[PDB]
Amino acid sequence: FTIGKAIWLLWGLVFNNSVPVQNPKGTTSKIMVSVWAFF
Amino acid sequence: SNGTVSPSAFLEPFSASVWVMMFVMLLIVSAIAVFVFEYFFTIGKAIWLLWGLVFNNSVPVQNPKGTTSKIMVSVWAFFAVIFLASYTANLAAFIQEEFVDQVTGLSDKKFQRPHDYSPPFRFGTVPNGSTERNIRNNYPYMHQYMTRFNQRGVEDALVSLKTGKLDAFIYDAAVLNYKAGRDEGCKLVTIGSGYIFATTGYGIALQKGSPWKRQIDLALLQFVGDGEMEELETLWLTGICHNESSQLDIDNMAGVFYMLAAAMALSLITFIWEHLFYW
Amino acid sequence: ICTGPNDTSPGSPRHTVPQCCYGFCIDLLIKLARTMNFTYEVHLVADGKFGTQERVNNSNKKEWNGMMGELLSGQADMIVAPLTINNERAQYIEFSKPFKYQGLTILVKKEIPRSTLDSFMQPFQSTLWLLVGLSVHVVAVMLYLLDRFSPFLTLSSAMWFSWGVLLNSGIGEGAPRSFSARILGMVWAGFAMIIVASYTANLAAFLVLDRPEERITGINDPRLRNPSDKFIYATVKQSSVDIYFRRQVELSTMYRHMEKHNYESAAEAIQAVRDNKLHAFIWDSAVLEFEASQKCDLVTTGELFFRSGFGIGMRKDSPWKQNVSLSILKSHENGFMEDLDKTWVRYQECDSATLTFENMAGVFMLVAGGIVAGIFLIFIEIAYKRH
Amino acid sequence: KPFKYQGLTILVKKEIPRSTLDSFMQPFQSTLWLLVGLSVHVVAVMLYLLDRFSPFLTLSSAMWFSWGVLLNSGIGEGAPRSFSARILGMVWAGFAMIIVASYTANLAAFLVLDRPEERITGINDPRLRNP
């Protein structure tokens, strides 16, 4: 998807405010999202 | 002692009735959510959504489509965030190390009957004193058992307690209070947080019929009335421990894992029950 | 069976009624009579005061009154009471070894933390609530205002998006489309999380260290040190505490307040403290501790000071002295005084979990209000559907 | 007459609160990491089992659901089909919330105080009485 949508989902899970986002489908992308959200 | 933390320490943030009443109003709100959704998604989905809103883990839920359902779910989420903030505000304070004394007092079964316990704990006192005479006059069996673990001086008993070859030391209250105050790190403490058994006093011994008795008594009581020995105690008798964050271990939050295991057991039980019912 | 005055109030005839006396001192006297054989006739002092050195209206004369006046006049032979030992009392009579060590301390009415209906709304100012509400309204309108004129979201959709992303719920599944609306929504969500984090931190700070009056650090309290009209503290008039306060030089300013407010007996003082008439009561540690054990809403807070002991007094020369002192010392030595302390002092009901049902009741009341207003909202929606 | 008024005082080291790479790993010890794994993996697989043997979501999807429960990613997309699996995800979400709240509270309590250097309170400090 677009870099803009990546920035949206990325920021919205940085600030866990139930922001409607388009989550990635790849497994390694999901790993990246999980570790980034732990941070 | 190495203090212990109650397993239900994370339940104390709210009284027992508070949890059950929030849960019943949760059920009521889920029921009315299903009702308003039907008017304009079963009960289970509503309950799951409500729990996930209270427990803001961003769990996958299916939001309703009705406007009034959305409104009441929003105010429910407001209640949820209020509750989460309130619970987290005092969570750190309640999860704290609590210190528990080894024994109750001189009347404890450990002192009276030291043999029936599998681990033999060692208590003793210096001889040729008033404490030994009192123990002899009160509990001859206790004195007979205690004579084996005798001590030579106050410092010898203190180092024996520090090392581990002794468990308790019975002696004059003021001396032990001073030693506990002046000890470093406060690894040693008097039982009962200042428990006193004989409650006698220190006096100025005089020969029988001495003429100095009355004058000395009056002078000492005059000192009592002017509070000078209060200054003397502050100068001499005070110590370090008298004036008075840590990592959380498994036992510190053992209640959380215990409830997790109970939830797993309930999971297996209800899974087997559903299997039997479906069959 | 003890003969005593019927009415403790002054200005009434004090008829000698034969009431019944029991408790700690009575049991101690009973064992004293059992050890050495002597029949006892117990009676109460006509004047409730403990008895201090007081200058009678006839000058050039110091008179002992109260229980000490009763004893020294030859009308009594032995006295049993929680009588503090001091120099003045020891000058004229001799005291046995103390049967209970205690000291002076301060009793205050424990302040139960009152829970207002606006406790949840307390951390944020009302004007701040109005400001955040107006901000919610303006952002909710301007989101779809900008989105509508985007050739490259409706009122309800944008409004519910705003409410969901401010309540951390997710009610509005719709999303803004134009990139300007994208940036505005992301920044508004950031603002909302800033608001909620500030609210959580403010509530945490307010909940901790929630104590309007810290403590009373004994007689060294600066609030206690400087008397004030609002801060009213007292003690039992004409007793040992009065003597201690009067004779001590540095505490003399304390005594300046003392004659302003005094009570005839300890019962009136504790009742006044319970009725919030008195801010502090100065009395013996044993009495105040027992009262706090019984009266669960009163607490002793001051650091223990003026350590002494309750003693049983006789005349200046009395053959009973040596034997009674030996008996009382033996009673301390064996397991009897501990038994009396257990059976007459130690037993208690409550002495003293936060955020109770009464503490955060406002959230339950607001949930009930929302429940009872949901029917009104559905009526309004039905009426709108009619139109 | 004195030309500079001053008294006696004490000089000590600053004792900087300088932190290490594990400035956020203090609340839980190393063992709990294994334990927290033991709190998720064995759950995820059995959740898959609850879907596998249901009368009416693979292992990887169950693992993703459990991870998104543990950490607030918001990926979702792992809602199970069995009623028991759904209620188990719910209760595990509750326990994850409790764990994260405990983490936040413990770290906050750890970082609000970084005193233990224990600055001397002048001549009245108890350490000075007994050298």
XYZ file of C-alpha atoms in Angstrom, chain C residues 23-193:
171
model
C -13.377 -3.049 85.252
C -9.592 -2.894 85.465
C -8.911 -1.130 88.763
C -11.671 -3.109 90.478
C -10.117 -6.433 89.452
C -6.688 -5.217 90.557
C -8.123 -4.202 93.936
C -9.842 -7.587 94.215
C -6.559 -9.438 93.753
C -4.888 -7.030 96.178
C -7.512 -7.941 98.781
C -7.118 -11.637 97.948
C -3.330 -11.666 98.406
C -3.289 -9.777 101.716
C -6.608 -10.136 103.514
C -8.462 -6.871 104.134
C -12.080 -5.908 103.530
C -12.586 -2.950 101.189
C -15.353 -0.347 100.927
C -15.207 1.305 97.502
C -16.732 4.729 96.924
C -16.521 7.479 94.331
C -15.170 10.954 94.977
C -17.876 13.603 95.251
C -15.980 15.978 92.944
C -15.138 14.466 89.568
C -11.841 16.350 89.316
C -8.620 14.407 89.809
C -7.356 17.021 92.240
C -4.503 19.501 91.925
C -2.884 22.188 94.046
C -5.544 24.912 93.935
C -5.644 28.246 95.763
C -9.021 28.446 97.521
C -10.848 31.768 97.849
C -9.300 31.990 101.315
C -5.791 33.165 100.474
C -2.532 31.944 102.037
C -3.692 28.329 101.785
C -3.076 25.597 99.213
C -5.754 22.911 99.362
C -5.792 19.427 97.880
C -9.194 18.622 96.389
C -10.878 15.875 94.407
C -9.693 12.349 95.087
C -6.529 13.716 96.681
C -8.597 15.939 98.957
C -10.621 12.848 99.828
C -7.479 10.849 100.642
C -5.449 13.455 102.534
C -8.311 14.539 104.807
C -8.340 11.137 106.512
C -11.607 10.173 104.810
C -9.842 7.580 102.623
C -7.103 5.025 103.256
C -6.109 3.892 99.750
C -6.826 5.144 96.239
C -7.068 3.185 92.984
C -7.459 5.102 89.716
C -5.523 5.923 86.544
C -3.610 8.507 88.568
C -0.512 9.964 86.927
C 2.604 10.203 89.091
C 4.242 13.630 89.317
C 6.370 15.576 91.780
C 3.489 17.493 93.378
C 1.483 14.346 94.078
C 4.555 12.490 95.352
C 5.507 15.286 97.764
C 2.514 14.716 100.051
C 1.762 11.002 99.521
C 3.738 7.932 98.490
C 2.928 5.872 95.402
C 3.380 2.173 94.750
C 5.130 0.780 91.697
C 3.122 1.644 88.563
C 0.666 -0.967 87.321
C 0.359 0.511 83.819
C 2.973 2.548 81.959
C 1.510 5.200 79.673
C 1.953 8.803 78.592
C 0.250 11.937 77.381
C -0.987 12.042 73.793
C -3.483 13.671 71.433
C -6.859 12.312 70.313
C -8.602 13.771 67.258
C -11.786 13.001 65.358
C -10.746 10.947 62.337
C -11.764 12.739 59.135
C -13.518 10.271 56.837
C -12.675 11.255 53.231
C -15.864 12.756 51.809
C -16.649 11.687 48.238
C -18.285 14.339 46.072
C -20.479 13.527 43.088
C -17.956 15.324 40.841
C -14.920 13.238 41.866
C -14.406 11.971 38.307
C -14.862 15.539 37.026
C -12.669 16.985 39.794
C -9.212 16.855 38.084
C -10.352 18.925 35.086
C -11.746 22.426 35.474
C -15.353 23.014 34.445
C -14.211 25.744 32.056
C -11.692 23.238 30.691
C -14.528 20.752 30.142
C -16.494 23.421 28.278
C -13.417 24.242 26.182
C -12.781 20.614 25.236
C -16.464 20.159 24.403
C -16.443 23.222 22.154
C -13.261 21.920 20.516
C -14.944 18.551 19.929
C -17.925 20.292 18.345
C -15.850 22.538 16.080
C -13.555 19.746 14.888
C -16.547 17.454 14.333
C -18.244 20.029 12.117
C -15.110 21.110 10.237
C -14.023 17.546 9.391
C -16.990 16.953 7.100
C -17.062 20.648 6.179
C -13.663 20.175 4.519
C -14.432 16.631 3.340
C -17.638 17.633 1.528
C -15.809 20.089 -0.756
C -13.166 17.550 -1.826
C -13.572 16.628 -5.513
C -10.553 14.303 -5.328
C -18.101 11.314 5.204
C -21.324 12.981 6.366
C -22.489 14.795 9.505
C -23.283 11.618 11.444
C -20.226 9.754 10.147
C -17.741 12.528 10.956
C -19.394 13.234 14.314
C -19.217 9.578 15.336
C -15.634 9.402 14.076
C -14.799 12.311 16.387
C -16.571 10.779 19.388
C -15.009 7.363 18.805
C -11.483 8.695 18.421
C -11.908 10.854 21.495
C -13.390 8.086 23.669
C -10.853 5.429 22.560
C -13.819 3.289 21.490
C -14.089 3.270 17.695
C -17.789 3.963 17.217
C -17.322 5.634 13.834
C -15.909 3.098 11.392
C -15.853 5.685 8.607
C -12.659 7.536 7.801
C -11.780 10.937 6.310
C -10.783 10.939 2.645
C -9.112 14.222 1.666
C -5.500 14.474 2.811
C -6.197 17.695 4.707
C -8.884 15.816 6.645
C -6.372 12.980 7.106
C -3.868 15.312 8.789
C -6.583 17.049 10.816
C -7.915 13.730 12.093
C -4.496 12.357 13.002
C -3.595 15.538 14.889
C -6.963 15.602 16.657
C -6.464 11.984 17.728
C -3.044 12.948 19.062
C -4.652 15.828 20.960
C -7.274 13.450 22.364
C -4.630 11.033 23.633
